[PDB]
Structure formats: structure tokens, C-alpha cells
Ligand binder design. Structure first.
Ligand SMILES: [Cl-]
Ligand SMILES: [Cl-]
Ligand SMILES: [Mg+2]
Ligand SMILES: [Mg+2]
Ligand SMILES: [Mg+2]
Length: 198
């Protein structure tokens, strides 16, 4: 309240080719008390992963929006953050993935919510997509693991649209990190962290 801050930091794509050429474009929105803030410097940082940012700091335009692009030559996951001076900590965007287009690779992992009740019933749903040649791959085995709770299954085969899904419940509270992988791709794909509460 009464502080300029990044309220949203999103990308136009969940994945791109690991050719160092295709760009993922991020948009940071900056508001104070819900009102767009113009001419505010937004600092961008690669929190984790291997990639290159086009800029490290850009000012918002007259709509309160500042953009930056990301490219990479390495298959993997990348987390980029955005911050304004008054924020205590940067806002992380959802991870994105750079893929070898010639190989069936996970291109996204999404959780339908980031919190749930720790009663063994309230389930968080994770959805992974697998693609090759920018097309979805069917019947690819995606294997899931977790640091907390019970997954509905360990391995699910992608459907005709490239998607595999599992649910996660927990009878005890805490943060949970779900990971996913496919064969022959050397990327430990991490889902957004979630948290269960009693
Ligand atoms: Cl996402
Ligand atoms: Cl459990
Ligand atoms: Mg989509
Ligand atoms: Mg693309
Ligand atoms: Mg439910």
C-alpha cells in the first residue's frame, strides 16, 4: 500500500527452442494502490537456469508495463524475476523451458492452485505437456515425484494433445515440490512450489 510494486510478471510463451534465437517476452506490470505507474525502472534477473536477458532494467511505459526478452542455447528450465526499488524481494515469474525441438520434451508444468488443505482429500492438479517439433506428443510416459504428500500416480502417458496429469494430496502440512521428467531429456522439470495447511 502506497508503494510502487510489480503486481504481475508474465511471459507470452511457456517454452521456446533452445537455439538462442527464439525469444520469450516477459511483461512486468507496476502499480501503486492499483494505479498504473509510468517511468518506473524494473530490474530483471535470471534467478536460475541458463539463458540470456535482453536487458537488466527497463522503465515502464505510460500503461505501467515494462518488457524484456529471454533466449537460451541450453535445454532446461529458467526462472526470471522482476523488481522495483521499494519491494522487499523480487517477484518470480513461473518457470519457462527451452527445448531441443528434435526430442520429445516437457514444455510446461502447471498447478491449478498453490495451496490446499492438509486433510488427504483436497487435491492439487498438475498438468504437464510434452512436445516434439512444436507438436504435442501422445503416449509419452511422464514420471512425477514429490517432496510431500501422495501423488495419484507415478507415471502417466500423455494424451493426444500432449498432456499428462496427476493429483497431489497430503495429510500433513508443509511446502511440496513436484518434479517431472521424460526419458532421454536431461532436465529435472520443477513445478511451482505449493503448500498444504492443516
Ligand atoms: Cl506456466
Ligand atoms: Cl499424505
Ligand atoms: Mg497452451
Ligand atoms: Mg514458440
Ligand atoms: Mg478438488
Amino acid at each position: 500500500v502506497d508503494q510502487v510494486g510489480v503486481t504481475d510478471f508474465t511471459a507470452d510463451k511457456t517454452s521456446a527452442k533452445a537455439d538462442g534465437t527464439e525469444a520469450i517476452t516477459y511483461t512486468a506490470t507496476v502499480k501503486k494502490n492499483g494505479v498504473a505507474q509510468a517511468n518506473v525502472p524494473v530490474s530483471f534477473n535470471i534467478v536460475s537456469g541458463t539463458a540470456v536477458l535482453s536487458a537488466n532494467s527497463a522503465n515502464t511505459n505510460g500503461s505501467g508495463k515494462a518488457t524484456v526478452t529471454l533466449k537460451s542455447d541450453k535445454p532446461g528450465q529458467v526462472v526470471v524475476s522482476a523488481k522495483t526499488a521499494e519491494m522487499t524481494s523480487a517477484l518470480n515469474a513461473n518457470a519457462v523451458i527451452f527445448v531441443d525441438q528434435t526430442k520429445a520434451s516437457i514444455t510446461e508444468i502447471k498447478a491449478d492452485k498453490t495451496t490446499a488443505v492438509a486433510n488427504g482429500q483436497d487435491a492439487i492438479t498438475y498438468t504437464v505437456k510434452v512436445m516434439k517439433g512444436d507438436k504435442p506428443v501422445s503416449n509419452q510416459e511422464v514420471t512425477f515425484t514429490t517432496t510431500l504428500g501422495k501423488l495419484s500416480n507415478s507415471t502417466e502417458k500423455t494424451d493426444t494433445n500432449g498432456y499428462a496429469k496427476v493429483t497431489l494430496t497430503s495429510t500433513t502440512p508443509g511446502k511440496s515440490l513436484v518434479s517431472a521428467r521424460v526419458s532421454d531429456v536431461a532436465v529435472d522439470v520443477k513445478a511451482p512450489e505449493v503448500e498444504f495447511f492443516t
